[PDB]
């Protein structure tokens, strides 16, 4: 449980994404700070490969759920800090309704004293006048709930949720997500109970920037096991 | 210029006194807008906050994420820093990017005396945020029990006063 | 505390701002009435004078011999200390026990620019002392050459203006 105790203060975070969508490659390097005692994430991402092909709100969920606030009477159900400092692997299949899809593989682990998250993304089957890559998505993001259950066969967790993205004309595009989180260590982890995780976030822009970027603030908590 | 912030992050109070004896700007932000006061406001460092404040400092300096020193000192739980920040003219109704006020964060984390201070310095209860929730909601859906109690007391007091 | 006077007496800037980061009374006198500002006014420091002044200090505190920081800084010859002391509200017409003004001592030591500054800050020429002598007398009986010239220029100008 030392992996739980190491999150006691601020932790600096660096994240690197190498993505390729329809042969169109790009990178996203993000830096920032995170507080796991109170579930706060303050990050800033920059595209180091020129103009971004894909709207930012689709990539936010790809771009560290070990920084979620668990209350004390639910400390028995914290899987993610149990898998530290060795790390773990996350597999996501992202289904965009009536469009193409994403497949993403990520590794989350400490390097030195910095939590790095590496991510390889492959997106296919999107129509060239689709509202995703036609740049019709709005620059705001909503609050959500994510449902989590155990898996003793892979000794990790299965995760599902469904995101509503905002379009210009008031329409709503839905993206479903499938996710597996499995450790790379072999020691003991915490097998959690069936519960959910609530999320608020805010996207913004930096005034004195010239590159393509995004500034993100996020709050995440967990609930479902409503014990006294 | 840039070896000031390092000594605030790090708890090196004597190095702060040495840099303040010489000429050094207290209002310095590196890449994001963040100040030695912001850094000494996250981690309690009552001595460094007081010496940065006595030499004159932006008490309400906008972070890139919209945060001010009061937000960080209310999130962390340092009561004395919140007292000395409020006595020096900090605004109790400053907003976060998500829409949070300092009372929202104080109710979210679960500090009681900080809520009692912010309520005694002019913070209002039923102020919404961008997603639409009041501090009472954050208090009830995060297991904080007596924060929700004094908030429900204030709501019932206002509602029963309006019913006449 | 009482460790501060060693600090300013020494020239130890860093050990002055450390003691001032803590709680320390600037208005402290050990056996004779003498202040850390008095000690940094006798010897020359600009840095300790400015940091003791920014933390709030009695700019004109009477020594046992009646001296203020301005008397000591005018006798010694530190020009920048006299400028920063005069800008902070020091009185130019404080009197010594023997009756001297800061202009008397500046004329006695022989600093020209300090005389020009004190003349520009409201010190008068023909002010007596207890033995009855003006600064012009001290200039003539102490080998200071140009001091006596600008003093006689001002005296003759006033006398010839009264003659009409």
From TrEMBL, chain A:
Similarity comment: Belongs to the GFP family.
Enumerate the UniProt keywords alphabetically.
Answer: Chromophore, Luminescence, Photoprotein
Cited InterPro entries: GFP (IPR009017), GFP-related (IPR011584), Green_fluorescent_prot (IPR000786)
- Please provide the Gene Ontology terms (biological process) for this protein: bioluminescence; generation of precursor metabolites and energy
Recorded superkingdom: Eukaryota
Tell me the protein's name. Green fluorescent protein
Keyword Iron (UniProt): no
Please give the Pfam families that the UniProt record associates with this protein.
Answer: GFP
Originating gene: gfp
UniProt keyword Transport, yes or no = no
